[PDB]
């Protein structure tokens, strides 16, 4: 491979004209507009690019060595927290190690298993999603048992599809390799099509469930777009023709919907969302003992877009809600619906400097809360009177989630972090006062010893003076003496927190090469609440990029990493982050760049699939004042001819409907046009398996792709196997 040998890429004469508040009419050539399309010319181009990328990777014998190490690092048994259904049995997911989809197991006995005996010794298969299609073309993307434990609803996607289909089966009818060989599927004839972008919410009478669906579309009808969502109700044992439309809004075709049902059967809740801002409406209906019927009466409790409201529970007409209303770090309020003018009060007040991330009601009257303080989760138990009783797992450092059912006398915590593979803790209210908290299961990994790795948090300063924390992970033999390479990962938007997580592949890379992993908590994320998001959003989105570039500069200046040896990686918004960072940062700031499925055409993102929802994140290119801050940031529109680019390996999936791949296609074509003689390769990989909505790749392909990515980075930074 050598510079200047990129595929022949036609440049059209297409020009789009935008309105700028400061400059008036702005003509913007789009010579690669044709890469938005699906044609034989595009297929020739993608094939040529993918062949070039693979030819380059074929030169690197270390990639196969990394595949071997990475596959081994993933080859350990994995499991979820178990859930106790109303049949008395416990159900949990189990992966033997390298299965592409984990398998839902049910306890042999109606008692909590001793999991030290082994999953197959204490449980039998209930639902194996790998058998949904013999060829692996179908995946289970979401599931939900009914409250009575009698039924299991499950959403299935297929390769090539843009929606999921919900099926229902009795909990007494397993789906396994044995059951398929021995008889018919076992499911009911119910087939609930066109499901997308909501949860499955059973009514507490177990008669049916709420789900969001879209209009049916014939193959050649319409465009690839999801509009005119409907919140619907499906009664078990019926066809979809009988489903009830609970809510839709023809006046606002872009809005989407969610629902919840109170444990006591009294209330149905409707949430409405207009964009990706964390603002929502909240309406409340009273259900009578007959449950959901047509013609529901909504009380419009929250009827303007101003804040995030999510129901926790209710006691009678007193509804407990997690909200950021006048509280950017979140809090719990009560809204008392027995009043005509609801009374609103703080139950758990906002903490100025810790985000309230999750609250669940447990054992009927208690509350379990997770606070994210300095991007590290803390777990607390609260009484019915709102008294903080105790901190649970006080020495845990990482990310935590709660799993429970309110009526039950236990809850679980799932705990993980950079060196914590996955611990499931149990709190049992029936146990003696000092014996209530225990460890149910700890994930045991393969080859790696998590104790060999350390994570710390350091603080650096961005351009504008803001102090930003950053996690640094290392194998403990690695010194911060200005010699290590660094992989710096980010997302940087949508109030998504860049939380600790366990990755055996990353740890294997760190140990193999003596490298460090860096995760800066840049603005645009949610780590410090709404104000942190607002600090990198719309007109302040540039701050996200400044924060990410400053992190890389800090790693080198302060001797965590060697000059030229910071590589960057991110996906979706994180791919935008990577692509904009390499355009904007001083030459030589980065040694390698891997944007995955990234946004890059910030002038047209709102014209494809669900991109209009991101106007709350990026601004609206059609508004002149907003064009003026978008255009200078858009990576496709800011490539220069005079800056050396780091080695770059862009990766996309051809079927991606979240971020259409034209973003990356235009970006790579623009790079290759502007700096064809760049000294470092500028390459793109294009996976041509068209994943259905919500579907993942097979494990073997994920391992192969990880080896290509991390091997590319290692070679670009000059790292050798030692």
């Amino acid at each position: 491979w050598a510079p200047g040998n990129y595929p022949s890429t036609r440049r059209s004469d297409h020009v789009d004209t935008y309105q700028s508040a400061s400059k008036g009419e702005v003509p913007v050539p789009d010579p690669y507009q044709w890469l938005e399309e699906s044609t034989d010319e595009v297929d020739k181009w993608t094939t040529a690019q993918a062949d070039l990328a693979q030819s380059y990777l074929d030169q690197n014998a270390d990639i196969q060595k990394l595949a071997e190490k990475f596959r081994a690092s993933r080859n350990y048994a994995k499991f979820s927290a178990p859930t106790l259904l109303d049949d008395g049995h416990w159900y949990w997911f189990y992966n033997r190690g390298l299965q592409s989809q984990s398998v839902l197991y049910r306890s042999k006995e109606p008692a909590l298993p001793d999991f030290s005996k082994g999953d197959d010794n204490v449980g039998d298969v209930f639902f194996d999603p790998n058998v949904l299609a013999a060829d692996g073309s179908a995946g289970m993307v979401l599931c939900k048992f009914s409250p009575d434990g009698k039924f299991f609803a499950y959403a299935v996607s297929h390769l090539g599809g843009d929606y999921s289909t919900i099926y229902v089966r009795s909990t007494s009818s397993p789906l396994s390799q044995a059951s398929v060989a021995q008889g018919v599927d076992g499911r009911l004839s119910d087939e609930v099509k066109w499901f997308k972008f909501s949860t499955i919410i059973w009514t507490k009478d177990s008669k049916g469930f709420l789900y969001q669906r879209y209009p049916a579309r014939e193959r050649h009808e319409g465009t690839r777009s999801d509009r005119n969502a409907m919140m619907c109700y499906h009664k078990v044992g019926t066809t979809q023709e009988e489903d009830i439309i609970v809510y839709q809004d023809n006046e606002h075709p872009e809005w989407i919907y969610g629902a919840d049902t109170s444990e006591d059967g009294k209330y149905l809740y409707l949430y409405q969302f207009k964009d990706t801002s964390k603002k929502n409406l909240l309406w409340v209906a009273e259900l009578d003992e007959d449950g959901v019927k047509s013609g529901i009466h909504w009380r419009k409790v929250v009827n303007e877009y101003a804040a995030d409201y999510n129901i926790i529970t209710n006691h009678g007409s007193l509804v407990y809600i997690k909200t950021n209303l006048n509280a950017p770090q979140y809090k719990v309020i009560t809204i008392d619906l027995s009043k005509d003018e609801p009374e609103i009060r703080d139950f758990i007040p906002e903490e100025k400097d810790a985000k309230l991330a999750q609250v669940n009601c447990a054992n009927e009257e208690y509350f379990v809360a997770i606070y994210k303080r300095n991007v590290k989760d803390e777990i607390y138990l609260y009484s019915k009177a709102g008294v903080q009783l105790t901190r649970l797992a006080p020495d845990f450092v990482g990310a935590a989630s709660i799993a429970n059912r309110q009526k039950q006398t236990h809850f679980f915590l799932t705990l993980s972090g950079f060196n914590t593979p996955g611990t499931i803790a149990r709190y049992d209210f029936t146990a003696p006062e000092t014996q209530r908290f225990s460890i149910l299961r700890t994930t045991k990994v393969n080859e790696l010893d998590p104790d060999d790795f350390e994570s710390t948090q350091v603080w650096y300063e961005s351009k504008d003076g803001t102090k930003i924390p950053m996690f640094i992970v290392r194998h403990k033999s690695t010194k911060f003496d200005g010699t290590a390479a660094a992989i710096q990962y980010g997302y940087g938007g949508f109030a998504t927190s860049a939380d600790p997580f366990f990755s055996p592949i990353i740890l294997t890379f760190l140990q193999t090469y003596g490298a460090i992993f860096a995760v800066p908590s840049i603005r645009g994320g949610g780590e410090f609440g709404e104000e942190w998001h607002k600090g990198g959003r719309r007109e302040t989105k540039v701050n996200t990029f400044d924060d990410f570039i400053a992190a890389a500069q800090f790693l080198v200046k302060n001797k965590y990493a060697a000059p030229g040896k910071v590589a960057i990686n991110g996906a979706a918004n994180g791919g935008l982050l990577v692509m904009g960072s390499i355009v904007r940062a001083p030459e030589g700031t980065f040694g390698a760049a891997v944007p995955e499925g990234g946004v890059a055409d910030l002038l047209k993102f709102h014209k494809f699939t669900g991109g209009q929802a991101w106007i709350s994140e990026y601004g609206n290119p059609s508004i002149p004042e907003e064009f003026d801050y978008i255009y200078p940031l858009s990576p496709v529109h800011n490539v220069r001819t005079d800056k050396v680019m780091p080695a770059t390996l862009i990766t996309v999936n051809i079927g991606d409907g979240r971020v259409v791949p034209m973003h990356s296609f235009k970006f790579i074509a623009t790079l290759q046009h502007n700096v064809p003689q760049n000294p470092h390769p500028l390459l793109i990989k294009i996976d041509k398996s068209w994943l259905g909505h919500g579907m993942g790749k097979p494990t073997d392909k994920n391992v192969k792709d990880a080896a290509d990515k991390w091997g590319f980075i290692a070679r670009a930074l000059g790292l050798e196997l030692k």
Binding site: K78, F79, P82, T83, F93, G149, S416, F501
Partner: peptide, 17 residues
């Protein structure tokens, strides 16, 4: 945040009933 890069089995039973 980590959909493709991290196995999600650990959290997959957090909200199934």
């Amino acid at each position: 945040w980590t959909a493709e890069h991290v196995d999600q089995t650990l959290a997959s039973g957090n909200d199934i009933c």
